[PDB]
Each structure stands twice: as structure tokens, then as C-alpha cells.
Fold:
Amino acid sequence: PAARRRARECAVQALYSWQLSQNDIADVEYQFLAEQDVKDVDVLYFRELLAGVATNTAYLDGLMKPYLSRLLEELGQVEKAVLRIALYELSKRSDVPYKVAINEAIELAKSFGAENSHKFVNGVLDKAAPVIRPNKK
Amino acid sequence: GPLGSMQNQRIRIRLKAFDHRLIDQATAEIVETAKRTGAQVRGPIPLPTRSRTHLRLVDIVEPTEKTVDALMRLDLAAGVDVQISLG
Ligand SMILES: [K+]
Structure:
């Protein structure tokens, strides 16, 4: 429950490291899990988000691009990670409900991003999410 | 140089900024700087805050003399604050 939310927060951070350092995702994953205090984290789900975003980056971004008013590379780094996480869940995780994916993204954009970030993130997901999940569930 | 008198071969860098674009570019430049000189990078990570401040942490490990030199000549954009510890 909460452990899965903590996994998302950690995935935002670890995905950020991967975007900025351009280290191997596997070294990013290992170092994060080794160094950080992940005592309350659903670690398996953390690993699946990392793997899930890292191996499908271009596909996830593709679900997103039509809905940005700008190029992908003009997006804030944290914004990109949160959205990738959400879109991965929407497209690849049936054990995550529609509302949960969107709301968890909103909360991540609040903790890790700007004042207005969550509004941008929600705006993109409002367009993108129904296309990935037409019944919205 | 101080590196020879340093028990922990690590350069820890903390950034604060109001603009996330500037903090992300600053972070990118720090990483590029470290790697060009043959050092390694742990992180960087963004830290959560409930305010309008953006926070980043980055560790530079296995630094060389040129790493320190290159970091000491690096100009960050105005609006980005920095803390450097050769702990
Ligand atoms: K640990």
C-alpha cells in the first residue's frame, strides 16, 4: 500500500539519476538500493518500475508527445520521470487502478517539482490516460 | 592538493534553486565536468520539499586533480546556489 507509493518516490529519484548521469540503469538501481534507506519501500515494485521505464522509454514518451505543447527535451527532468512512471502504470500495470496512477503522479509532481508542475502533469495525463485506458478504470 | 589528505575520496555537491530548468542544467554540467576528468558520479538525486525550492544532491567519487580544478572553475547560472564538501 504505502510501500508502493514509497517505491514510486524512490523511482522518481532513481530515474532522475539515470537521466542525468547516463549511468547504466542496473548500476543506478544497485547503488540506490545499496546506499539509500529503503526500509519502507516495496523493493520488487521499485525494480519493476525502473526496468519498466528504462527498457520502454521511447514507447512511453510516444504515448505522451502528442499532448505536450513542446518538444520532449524541453520538459523538466523530474516531470519526465513522473510522467514515465504514470504512463508505464497506465499501459503495463492492470493491478494499478486508473485513478491511482493519475493521483500518484499528481502527488509526486508536488513533492519533487515546481508549484505548477502537478497541474501540467495532470493536464497531460487527462489527455493521455483515456487513450491508453478507454473505459478509464 | 587536498585530495591526498582526504580519507573519503568524495566531492558532495548540493544545489538549491527556484527554477528547475536552471538546476537541471547546472546538475548536467557538474556531471559532464566530473566525467570529462575521469571521475564517477553517484546520483544525482532530487530531494523532496514542500516549498518552491528545488534541491539536488550529487556525489563525485574517484576524483582526480583535474576534477577539482575543473569544478573550481565552473560557473553556475545566477539563481542556483551551491554547497561543496570535500568531506
Ligand atoms: K540500503
User: Anything to note?
Assistant: DSSP finds seven helices and no strands in chain A.
